[PDB]
Structures are given as C-alpha cells and as structure tokens.
C-alpha cells in the first residue's frame, strides 16, 4: 500500500502519524538520568505506535518489525530531540518543561560529548532550514534503513519511495535539479552522524546498567538488543 501512495499522500500520512511531544516529570547525575529514562520510556510506546502507522512497516513480519525498532530506537529518539531543539540554539529540548544546557551535560560522565554532537546536529538542521515534511521522511528512513543489512526488496522499495518523496518536496520548494541532489545528499549524510551518536549513547546507557538509576523493562530489552 505504501508504494501506491503519491508523494503528497506519503507526506500527509507521515505528518498524521507523528508522535506527540511528551512532558517531563515536573540536576545531579541520578536525578537527570531518572527524568530522561522516564521520558524515553514513555516516548518508546508512542514510537512503536508511530512505526505501525508508517507506510510499509505493517507489511513486514513481526520479527522484522521488532528488529528494525531495536536497531534504530535511539536514533529515532535523537533525531526527534534534535528537531525539537532546532529553534532553541545551544539548548536541547528533551521536553517543553525540560530544557537542558551544554553545561548541564557535564554532571554526567561522558554525556557532555554526546550533548555537543546533538547540539551540532540541531545547528546543522537550523542552517539547512530543515522542514517538518523533510524531517518525517528522514525519521522514517532511519526506521527502515538502520537495520536492513543486519537481516528486503520491499524495504528498499519503500526507501526509494521516501527518496522520491524527499525530492518531490524540494522540487516543490523551488530548488533546481542540482540543488535537489546536493540537499538530499546533505540530509542523508547527517543520518550517518545520528548513527554515530546513537552508538555512543547506547554505550553510555550500558554503563548505566552496569552501575545500577533503574532502567525500565522495555528500555532494558531495547538495550540488550545491542549486545
């Protein structure tokens, strides 16, 4: 059904499936990671339901759906975080009532480095003037791509559709042909960095488990999927 939809119907479906922006519980190391663990755990439940509303994701087997989410869940949270923090330069909008600074990432060992990478990605989106329509395409790409080689033709076909959709948006924005190729390439190259942050953050969360705030049962499962 995903392949049938036009670029406009592809955008509208992704825009309609967008998860809400959740609030934090109304810092030291323990208190901050406590708030973030609680937040991320509630976001995952919405992400899972968001993924099921992603065109082509339903058509996959239950096992493949699980594998893709396990691979990219932190990437998806991050690109969401980065997007939310776009109009808050120097700040990370984890939640509307939880704005974190670069100096606030210092009271957790090895987190200030992840903060800067996130802030830099948000700064990159701001400079590129990333659109909401572009953002929902990128996030869907992360979902379908990040765990596609750890397995296929259908997933690659949906990926091509989102690519067609991405170009369509730029072609409707008034960009020339070479401007469309360059902007597309620029966006997709950022996903490589989002993966990098994810693997760094994943290793950071693993240190948390090997120290006993208590991670949620769901988070522990998503975490264990990365060995």
């Amino acid at each position: 059904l995903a392949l049938s939809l036009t670029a406009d119907q592809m955008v509208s479906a992704l825009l309609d499936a967008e998860p809400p922006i959740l609030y934090s519980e109304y810092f030291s190391e323990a208190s901050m990671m406590g708030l973030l663990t609680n937040l991320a755990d509630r976001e995952l439940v919405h992400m899972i339901n968001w993924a099921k509303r992603v065109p082509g994701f339903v058509d996959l087997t239950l096992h493949d759906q699980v594998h893709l989410l396990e691979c990219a869940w932190l990437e998806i949270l991050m690109i969401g975080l980065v997007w939310r923090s776009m109009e808050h330069p120097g700040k990370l909008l984890f939640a509307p009532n939880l704005l974190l600074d670069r100096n606030q990432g210092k009271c957790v060992e090895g987190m200030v480095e992840i903060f800067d990478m996130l802030l830099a990605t948000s700064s990159r989106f701001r400079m590129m003037n990333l659109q909401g329509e572009e953002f929902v395409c990128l996030k869907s790409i992360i979902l379908l791509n990040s765990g596609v080689y750890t397995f296929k033709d259908h997933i690659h076909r949906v990926l091509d559709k989102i690519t067609d959709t991405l170009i369509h948006l730029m072609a409707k924005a008034g960009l020339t042909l070479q401007q469309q190729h360059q902007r597309l390439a620029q966006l997709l190259l950022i996903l490589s960095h989002i993966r990098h942050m994810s693997n760094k953050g994943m290793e950071h969360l693993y240190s948390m488990k090997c120290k006993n705030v208590p991670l949620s049962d769901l988070l522990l499962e998503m975490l264990d999927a990365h060995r």
Binding site: N49, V66, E221
Partner: peptide, 10 residues
Amino acid sequence: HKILHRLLQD
C-alpha cells in the same frame, strides 16, 4: 518473549 512484541500487536 519481548515486551516489544505485545506493543507491536496491540
């Protein structure tokens, strides 16, 4: 089985 299984089914 994983929790993720249930949330993907419900």
